[PDB]
Amino acid sequence: SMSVKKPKRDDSKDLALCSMILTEMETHEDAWPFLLPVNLKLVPGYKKVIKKPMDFSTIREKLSSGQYPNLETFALDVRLVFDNCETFNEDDSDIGRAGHNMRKYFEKKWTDTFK
């Protein structure tokens, strides 16, 4: 509260570390469904059903231009990528499996890096 603060967690490497994580996600072999925005002209249903589209290129641009106020807002966008994937794709499709694998990959790097 006013003039009563918890000790200061060092956040100065957060930007670099989120960049590194994102690079590792970008270069994974199962990243291909997630590298670019879904083409809303060519994929029936996507626009109306997925209220907040997200993809790795868009996360990379946001990261590079100071649009993440902290590491939790970055983790929310990454998880949004996988949540959207589960919303639109069957678990037993190549893309559905890709999405479960990538979420697992991400959550381990996240825990190892920050927790």
From Swiss-Prot:
Compartments in which it is found: Nucleus
Bromo domain mapped to chain residues: 9-113
Free-text tissue specificity from the UniProt record: Expressed at varying levels in several tissues, whereas a smaller transcript was expressed specifically in testis.
Subunit structure: Component of the BRF-1 ISWI chromatin remodeling complex, at least composed of SMARCA1 and BAZ2B, which regulates the spacing of histone octamers on the DNA template to facilitate access to DNA. Within the BRF-1 ISWI chromatin remodeling complex interacts with SMARCA1; the interaction is direct. Component of the BRF-5 ISWI chromatin remodeling complex, at least composed of SMARCA5/SNF2H and BAZ2B, which regulates the spacing of histone octamers on the DNA template to facilitate access to DNA.
Function: Regulatory subunit of the ATP-dependent BRF-1 and BRF-5 ISWI chromatin remodeling complexes, which form ordered nucleosome arrays on chromatin and facilitate access to DNA during DNA-templated processes such as DNA replication, transcription, and repair. Both complexes regulate the spacing of nucleosomes along the chromatin and have the ability to slide mononucleosomes to the center of a DNA template. The BRF-1 ISWI chromatin remodeling complex has a lower ATP hydrolysis rate than the BRF-5 ISWI chromatin remodeling complex.
Family: Belongs to the WAL family.
Protein name per its UniProtKB record: Bromodomain adjacent to zinc finger domain protein 2B
Gene from which the chain derives: BAZ2B
Residues of the full protein shown: 2054 to 2166 of 2168
